[PDB]
C-alpha cells in the first residue's frame, strides 16, 4: 500500500530502475526544469531532437556507466508559466504508464524547481502522487496465465523534504485505496458483483472500521418499507436485491449530515424494453454509482474526516424475463408517489427515488448527493471526460465545482429546467419515468427532484453515465472503470464540510 517516498538529497538517493527527469517547453524546445548533473545531460542529448517538453510528452532512453539509474524517462510539463495541477497529474500519470510498460519496479522522480512559479510545492506533490497512484492500478484480469503489467513498487521523489512530501503521499495513498475499490467493483464480472456482493463489501467495511455501522435490507425488508419502486425493478431478477445503509459518525456533536446515494444496478439488460446487444455490452458498469459511494466510504473511514456521512445503496439487477416489471404499469414508492413506466430501461431513477425517500424519512440529511450511471443523454451532452451534475442549491454547486477544478475530475453543472418538469406528466400517476422531450438527462434529474417532495434539503445529482467507464483509455484514468468522483467528493467533504 505504501508506494511514494520523499528524498531530500539528489546525491544520497538509492539506485532505482528508472529516473524521471522533468522538462518545460521553451520556444518549442525542451528545457530542464531541475538542475541535472552534466554527465546525465550528455546521456540524453541524442533524444532532444524529437523531444520538446510538451506536457505529457515522454522520451525513453537507457543510462550508462556514468548514471545511477539505467533507464531514463524525460517528461514534458509544458510551458512553465502555464503549469497547472491537471497538467502535473496527467503528466505523471503518463510517465507511470511508460515506466510500467518498460517493466520498471522502482523509480526516482526528480522534483522540478518551481520556486519562481506561483505554483505551490503542495499542489505539485498532490497531483504528482495522484497521477502515479491512478495509473499504478491494474483492472482485474482472468487469463489462464497471469499477463498483467507489473506494478511500480517504490517511487521516490527527489528534492523535497520528508515532512512536506510524506504527509501528502500517505493521504493520497489511503484515498486511492478507496478509488481502487470502486474501480475493482465496476470492472469485475456482473455475475460476481451481485447486490449480495455489494452488501458483503459494505459489511466488510463496517466490520473493519469502528466508526462505520451498516444496515442491510433484503427483498422482504425492502417490501416491508414499501419501497415498491426498488421492488418493481428487482421483481424479475434471478439474484436477490439489497438496500444498503452505511453510517459514519465522525462528528457526533453536529447535526450536519451528508447523505450519499449510489445507483447499484449490477447489470442492466434494459428489462422488457431490452437494450440492443451493443448497448448492453458494458452494463456491468451500471452499479458504478454504488461503487463510488463504497470507495468514498473506504477513504472517509481511513482518513477519519470529522464529519457525519450516510451512504445509501439500492442494488438490483434489471433483468428481462417472465416476472420482469411491466412497461405501462404504475408502481408506488415508499411515500406513496406513483410512477407510470414509460420504459423499463429507465430503472435507475426508480431505485434512487426510493433511496431518496428513505434518506428523508430516516437520515435527517443536511444535503443529499447522488451518483448514477443514469442517462445516455448525458454522454451526448458532455461526453466521456466531463460529468454533468444538477443541484437545487447554488452554494453546493459552487463548492462541488471548486472541488472538481482542484482534483481534475471535471464536472459541469446542467440546469433543472422548470419548463421540462411537465415533460414527466402522467394522467394516471404522479409522474412517468421518462420525459416527453429529448432532454433525457434533465428530465431524469427532474424526476429525482420530485422525491424531495419540497423538503428544503440541499441536493446534487451526478450523472456519471459517461465518466464511470472508459472503453478507450484516457488520462488521467486507466482503461475501463475510472473511479471518477471518489477523489472529487473526498476533497469536497474535507475542504467544505470538515473544517
Ligand atoms: C424510436 C425508438 C425509441 C425505438 C425503440 N426500439 C423503442 O421502441 O423503444
Ligand atoms: Cl425497442
Ligand atoms: Cl451545502
Ligand atoms: Na491496495
Ligand atoms: Na463498525
Ligand atoms: Na427500446
Ligand atoms: Na463511459
Ligand atoms: Zn437502464
Ligand atoms: Zn441502469
Amino acid at each position: 500500500v505504501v508506494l511514494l517516498y520523499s528524498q531530500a538529497s539528489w546525491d544520497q538517493r538509492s539506485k532505482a530502475d528508472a529516473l524521471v527527469l522533468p522538462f518545460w517547453m521553451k520556444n518549442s524546445k525542451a528545457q530542464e526544469a531541475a538542475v541535472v548533473d552534466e554527465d546525465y545531460k550528455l546521456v540524453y542529448q541524442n533524444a532532444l531532437s524529437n523531444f520538446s517538453g510538451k506536457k505529457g510528452e515522454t522520451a525513453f532512453l537507457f543510462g550508462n556507466d556514468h548514471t545511477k539509474e539505467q533507464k531514463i524517462v524525460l517528461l514534458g510539463l509544458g510551458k512553465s508559466e502555464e503549469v497547472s495541477g491537471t497538467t502535473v497529474l496527467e503528466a505523471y500519470a503518463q510517465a507511470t504508464t511508460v515506466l510500467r510498460k518498460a517493466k520498471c519496479k522502482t523509480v526516482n522522480i526528480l522534483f522540478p524547481t518551481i520556486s519562481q512559479l506561483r505554483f505551490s510545492v503542495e499542489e505539485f506533490l498532490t497531483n504528482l502522487a495522484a497521477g502515479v497512484l491512478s495509473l499504478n492500478y491494474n483492472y482485474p484480469t482472468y487469463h489462464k496465465v497471469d499477463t498483467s503489467l507489473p506494478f511500480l513498487e517504490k517511487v521516490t521523489v527527489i528534492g523535497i523534504v520528508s515532512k512536506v512530501g510524506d504527509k501528502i503521499f500517505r493521504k493520497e495513498e489511503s484515498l486511492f485505496e478507496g478509488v481502487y475499490l470502486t474501480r475493482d467493483l465496476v470492472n469485475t464480472n456482473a455475475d460476481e458483483v451481485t447486490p449480495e456482493k455489494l452488501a458483503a463489501v459494505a459489511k466488510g467495511l463496517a466490520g473493519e472500521f469502528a466508526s462505520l455501522d451498516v444496515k442491510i435490507l433484503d427483498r422482504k425488508a425492502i417490501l416491508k418499507e414499501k419501497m415498491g419502486l426498488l421492488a418493481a425493478v428487482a421483481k424479475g431478477a434471478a439474484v436477490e436485491p439489497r438496500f444498503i445503509v452505511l453510517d459514519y459518525q465522525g462528528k457526533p456533536k453536529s447535526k450536519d449530515r451528508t447523505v450519499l446515494i449510489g445507483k447499484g444496478v449490477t447489470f442492466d439488460s434494459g428489462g422488457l424494453d431490452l437494450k440492443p446487444g451493443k448497448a448492453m455490452i458494458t452494463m456491468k458498469e451500471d452499479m458504478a454509482g454504488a461503487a463510488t459511494v463504497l470507495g468514498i466510504f473506504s477513504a472517509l473511514a481511513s482518513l477519519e474526516l470529522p464529519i457525519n456521512v450516510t451512504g445509501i445503496i439500492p442494488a438490483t439487477e434489471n433483468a428481462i424475463g417472465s416476472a420482469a416489471y411491466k412497461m405501462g404499469d404504475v408502481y408506488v414508492g415508499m411515500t406513496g408517489l406513483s410512477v407510470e413506466i414509460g420504459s423499463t430501461d429507465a430503472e435507475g431513477r426508480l431505485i434512487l427515488a426510493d433511496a431518496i425517500s428513505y434518506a428523508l424519512k430516516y437520515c435527517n440529511p443536511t444535503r443529499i448527493i447522488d451518483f448514477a450511471t443514469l442517462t445516455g443523454a448525458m454522454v451526448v451532452s458532455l461526453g466521456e471526460s466531463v460529468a454533468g451534475f444538477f443541484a437545487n442549491n447554488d452554494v453546493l454547486a459552487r463548492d462541488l465545482a471548486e472541488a472538481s477544478s482542484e482534483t481534475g475530475e471535471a464536472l459541469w453543472r446542467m440546469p433543472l429546467v422548470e419548463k421540462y418538469d411537465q415533460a414527466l406528466h402522467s394522467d394516471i400517476a404522479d409522474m412517468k419515468n421518462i420525459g416527453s422531450n429529448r432532454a433525457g438527462s434533465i428530465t431524469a434529474a427532474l424526476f429525482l427532484q420530485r422525491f424531495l417532495e419540497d423538503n428544503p434539503v440541499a441536493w446534487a445529482h451526478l450523472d456519471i453515465a459517461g465518466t464511470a467507464y472508459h472503453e478507450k483509455e484516457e488520462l488521467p484514468y486507466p482503461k475501463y472503470a475510472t473511479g471518477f468522483g471518489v477523489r472529487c467528493l473526498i476533497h469536497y467533504m474535507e475542504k467544505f464540510l470538515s473544517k
Side-chain angles (χ1 to χ4, degrees), residues 2-14 16-25 27-28 30-38 40-41 43-49 51-53 55-64 67-78 80-102 104-117 119-162 164-166 168-202 204-223 225-252 254 256-421 423-498:
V2 170
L3 175 68
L4 291 141
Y5 299 83
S6 303
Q7 167 68 236
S9 165
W10 162 261
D11 289 304
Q12 294 184 8
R13 74 195 195 279
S14 305
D17 300 332
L19 171 67
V20 179
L21 293 175
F23 291 81
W24 310 116
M25 180 182 56
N27 306 135
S28 287
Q31 170 191 70
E32 281 92 5
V35 191
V36 178
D37 184 353
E38 204 85 29
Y40 287 67
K41 292 173 163 220
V43 174
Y44 59 75
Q45 283 309 292
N46 305 78
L48 269 93
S49 66
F51 171 79
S52 35
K55 47 192 175 211
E57 185 181 14
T58 59
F60 185 93
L61 62 128
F62 300 97
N64 60 21
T67 68
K68 193 168 284 250
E69 304 82 350
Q70 287 310 290
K71 307 190 185 133
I72 295 164
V73 181
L74 317 182
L75 178 66
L77 300 176
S80 55
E81 69 275 359
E82 303 187 29
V83 70
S84 66
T86 58
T87 296
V88 169
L89 200 155
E90 295 192 350
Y92 283 98
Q94 184 60 52
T96 297
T97 294
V98 171
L99 294 159
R100 297 186 64 200
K101 287 175 175 171
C104 302
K105 300 210 197 157
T106 60
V107 188
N108 287 334
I109 297 182
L110 181 58
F111 192 78
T113 315
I114 62 174
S115 54
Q116 71 282 26
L117 308 178
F119 202 73
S120 83
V121 176
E122 292 88 336
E123 183 168 6
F124 199 108
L125 285 175
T126 297
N127 284 285
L128 183 158
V132 173
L133 289 161
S134 183
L135 269 296
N136 203 39
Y137 167 85
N138 275 343
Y139 44 80
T141 54
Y142 303 84
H143 306 74
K144 176 167 174 161
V145 173
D146 196 331
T147 319
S148 54
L149 216 43
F151 292 116
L152 299 185
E153 300 184 353
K154 188 183 190 174
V155 178
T156 306
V157 177
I158 310 304
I160 53 160
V161 7
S162 173
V164 49
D166 284 354
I168 291 166
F169 297 155
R170 301 294 162 264
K171 188 206 157 193
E172 284 303 309
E173 285 164 351
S174 308
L175 166 46
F176 267 87
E177 288 293 311
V179 172
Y180 292 172
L181 174 66
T182 297
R183 296 178 179 175
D184 282 350
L185 290 169
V186 175
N187 278 322
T188 298
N189 280 342
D191 279 352
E192 176 171 356
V193 179
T194 61
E196 284 187 17
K197 175 69 180 188
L198 290 181
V201 171
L205 279 175
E208 179 177 351
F209 293 102
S211 60
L212 278 184
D213 288 287
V214 68
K215 181 171 185 164
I216 306 300
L217 283 61
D218 61 7
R219 193 193 300 264
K220 178 192 199 62
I222 288 155
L223 284 164
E225 292 288 343
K226 308 191 183 307
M227 288 189 289
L229 302 174
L230 170 55
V233 177
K235 187 182 177 294
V239 293
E240 289 301 300
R242 290 293 187 264
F243 186 91
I244 301 152
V245 182
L246 277 163
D247 192 42
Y248 174 81
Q249 277 205 80
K251 183 132 67 199
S254 176
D256 185 87
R257 193 144 159 205
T258 298
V259 170
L260 307 180
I261 304 183
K263 168 183 170 176
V265 174
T266 54
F267 184 84
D268 190 359
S269 68
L272 289 175
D273 196 4
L274 180 68
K275 290 178 180 302
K278 285 182 169 168
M280 202 193 297
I281 185 79
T282 70
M283 283 299 105
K284 74 191 179 181
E285 73 169 282
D286 210 35
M287 41 57 72
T292 305
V293 171
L294 293 165
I296 291 167
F297 263 79
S298 173
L300 172 63
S302 299
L303 295 174
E304 303 185 320
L305 304 189
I307 57 180
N308 304 319
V309 189
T310 300
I312 297 176
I313 292 160
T316 180
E317 291 193 8
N318 190 25
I320 181 166
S322 57
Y325 78 122
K326 290 200 170 59
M327 296 287 277
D329 263 22
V330 177
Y331 302 94
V332 182
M334 54 164 295
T335 74
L337 289 168
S338 53
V339 179
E340 178 183 10
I341 303 310
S343 171
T344 62
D345 200 15
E347 88 295 338
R349 66 196 71 182
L350 266 45
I351 77 180
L352 289 173
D354 270 334
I356 289 164
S357 297
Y358 187 100
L360 293 170
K361 179 165 179 178
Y362 296 116
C363 304
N364 235 288
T366 312
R367 64 197 61 79
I368 299 169
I369 303 167
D370 77 72
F371 311 83
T373 50
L374 202 60
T375 61
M378 180 54 63
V379 193
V380 171
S381 305
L382 284 161
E384 73 280 12
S385 305
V386 184
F389 78 99
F390 299 81
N392 68 357
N393 180 288
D394 288 333
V395 173
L396 177 56
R398 180 206 67 201
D399 290 356
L400 288 169
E402 188 173 341
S404 167
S405 175
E406 290 175 0
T407 60
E409 308 212 290
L411 295 180
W412 192 260
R413 188 185 190 176
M414 296 296 280
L416 291 158
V417 180
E418 289 189 5
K419 280 185 205 305
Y420 302 162
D421 224 339
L424 298 166
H425 174 87
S426 167
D427 288 323
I428 64 179
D430 289 289
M431 68 206 79
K432 295 191 181 179
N433 77 333
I434 56 173
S436 57
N437 71 359
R438 293 176 63 194
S441 303
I442 303 182
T443 55
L446 292 167
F447 178 102
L448 299 174
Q449 189 175 49
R450 300 297 191 88
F451 289 82
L452 306 178
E453 307 194 60
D454 307 305
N455 190 289
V457 60
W459 162 69
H461 156 56
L462 281 63
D463 193 340
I464 57 174
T467 60
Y469 188 88
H470 282 174
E471 289 265 64
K472 178 175 173 9
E473 179 165 0
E474 301 286 5
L475 298 180
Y477 300 105
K479 203 175 184 174
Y480 303 121
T482 60
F484 180 101
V486 175
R487 262 198 97 235
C488 184
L489 264 288
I490 287 289
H491 178 57
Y492 161 77
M493 296 189 305
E494 183 174 18
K495 182 178 184 171
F496 297 101
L497 302 185
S498 77

mmCIF file of all heavy atoms in Angstrom, residues 285 384 465-471, ligand 7:
data_model
loop_
_atom_site.group_PDB
_atom_site.id
_atom_site.type_symbol
_atom_site.label_atom_id
_atom_site.label_comp_id
_atom_site.label_asym_id
_atom_site.label_seq_id
_atom_site.Cartn_x
_atom_site.Cartn_y
_atom_site.Cartn_z
ATOM 1 N N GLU A 285 -21.220 -1.966 -15.717
ATOM 2 C CA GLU A 285 -20.849 -0.667 -15.159
ATOM 3 C C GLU A 285 -22.010 0.043 -14.491
ATOM 4 O O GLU A 285 -21.796 1.088 -13.858
ATOM 5 C CB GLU A 285 -20.291 0.250 -16.250
ATOM 6 C CG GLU A 285 -21.372 0.800 -17.223
ATOM 7 C CD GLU A 285 -20.810 1.899 -18.106
ATOM 8 O OE1 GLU A 285 -20.668 3.032 -17.619
ATOM 9 O OE2 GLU A 285 -20.461 1.618 -19.266
ATOM 10 N N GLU A 384 -17.373 11.698 -22.412
ATOM 11 C CA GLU A 384 -16.833 10.700 -21.500
ATOM 12 C C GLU A 384 -15.874 11.273 -20.452
ATOM 13 O O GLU A 384 -15.492 10.546 -19.525
ATOM 14 C CB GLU A 384 -16.105 9.625 -22.327
ATOM 15 C CG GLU A 384 -14.745 10.112 -22.934
ATOM 16 C CD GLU A 384 -14.807 10.981 -24.232
ATOM 17 O OE1 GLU A 384 -15.886 11.478 -24.675
ATOM 18 O OE2 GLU A 384 -13.711 11.168 -24.817
ATOM 19 N N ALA A 465 -22.863 8.700 -16.282
ATOM 20 C CA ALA A 465 -23.061 7.722 -17.350
ATOM 21 C C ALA A 465 -21.921 7.747 -18.363
ATOM 22 O O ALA A 465 -21.640 6.726 -19.001
ATOM 23 C CB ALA A 465 -24.395 7.964 -18.060
ATOM 24 N N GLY A 466 -21.260 8.891 -18.535
ATOM 25 C CA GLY A 466 -20.126 8.954 -19.444
ATOM 26 C C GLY A 466 -18.768 8.694 -18.804
ATOM 27 O O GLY A 466 -17.906 8.040 -19.409
ATOM 28 N N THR A 467 -18.555 9.181 -17.578
ATOM 29 C CA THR A 467 -17.224 9.176 -16.967
ATOM 30 C C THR A 467 -16.918 7.919 -16.166
ATOM 31 O O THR A 467 -15.762 7.726 -15.768
ATOM 32 C CB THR A 467 -17.044 10.384 -16.033
ATOM 33 O OG1 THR A 467 -18.031 10.325 -14.998
ATOM 34 C CG2 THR A 467 -17.181 11.706 -16.800
ATOM 35 N N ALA A 468 -17.912 7.064 -15.904
ATOM 36 C CA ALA A 468 -17.690 5.965 -14.971
ATOM 37 C C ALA A 468 -16.839 4.848 -15.569
ATOM 38 O O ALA A 468 -16.183 4.111 -14.822
ATOM 39 C CB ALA A 468 -19.030 5.396 -14.506
ATOM 40 N N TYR A 469 -16.839 4.695 -16.890
ATOM 41 C CA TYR A 469 -16.241 3.517 -17.515
ATOM 42 C C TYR A 469 -15.769 3.911 -18.901
ATOM 43 O O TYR A 469 -16.563 4.411 -19.697
ATOM 44 C CB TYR A 469 -17.276 2.395 -17.594
ATOM 45 C CG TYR A 469 -16.774 1.046 -18.034
ATOM 46 C CD1 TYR A 469 -16.276 0.138 -17.104
ATOM 47 C CD2 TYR A 469 -16.831 0.662 -19.373
ATOM 48 C CE1 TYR A 469 -15.844 -1.121 -17.496
ATOM 49 C CE2 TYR A 469 -16.402 -0.596 -19.776
ATOM 50 C CZ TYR A 469 -15.914 -1.482 -18.828
ATOM 51 O OH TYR A 469 -15.488 -2.722 -19.219
ATOM 52 N N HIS A 470 -14.495 3.699 -19.207
ATOM 53 C CA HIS A 470 -13.929 4.164 -20.471
ATOM 54 C C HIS A 470 -13.550 2.967 -21.337
ATOM 55 O O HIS A 470 -12.611 2.234 -21.015
ATOM 56 C CB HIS A 470 -12.712 5.048 -20.216
ATOM 57 C CG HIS A 470 -13.055 6.446 -19.794
ATOM 58 N ND1 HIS A 470 -12.099 7.359 -19.407
ATOM 59 C CD2 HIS A 470 -14.246 7.087 -19.706
ATOM 60 C CE1 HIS A 470 -12.684 8.507 -19.107
ATOM 61 N NE2 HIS A 470 -13.986 8.369 -19.281
ATOM 62 N N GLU A 471 -14.245 2.789 -22.460
ATOM 63 C CA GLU A 471 -13.831 1.742 -23.393
ATOM 64 C C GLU A 471 -12.512 2.090 -24.054
ATOM 65 O O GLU A 471 -11.781 1.198 -24.497
ATOM 66 C CB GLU A 471 -14.906 1.520 -24.462
ATOM 67 C CG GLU A 471 -16.165 0.855 -23.953
ATOM 68 C CD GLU A 471 -16.154 -0.649 -24.163
ATOM 69 O OE1 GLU A 471 -15.293 -1.333 -23.569
ATOM 70 O OE2 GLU A 471 -17.002 -1.143 -24.937
HETATM 71 NA NA1 LIG B 7 -18.380 5.648 -20.489
#
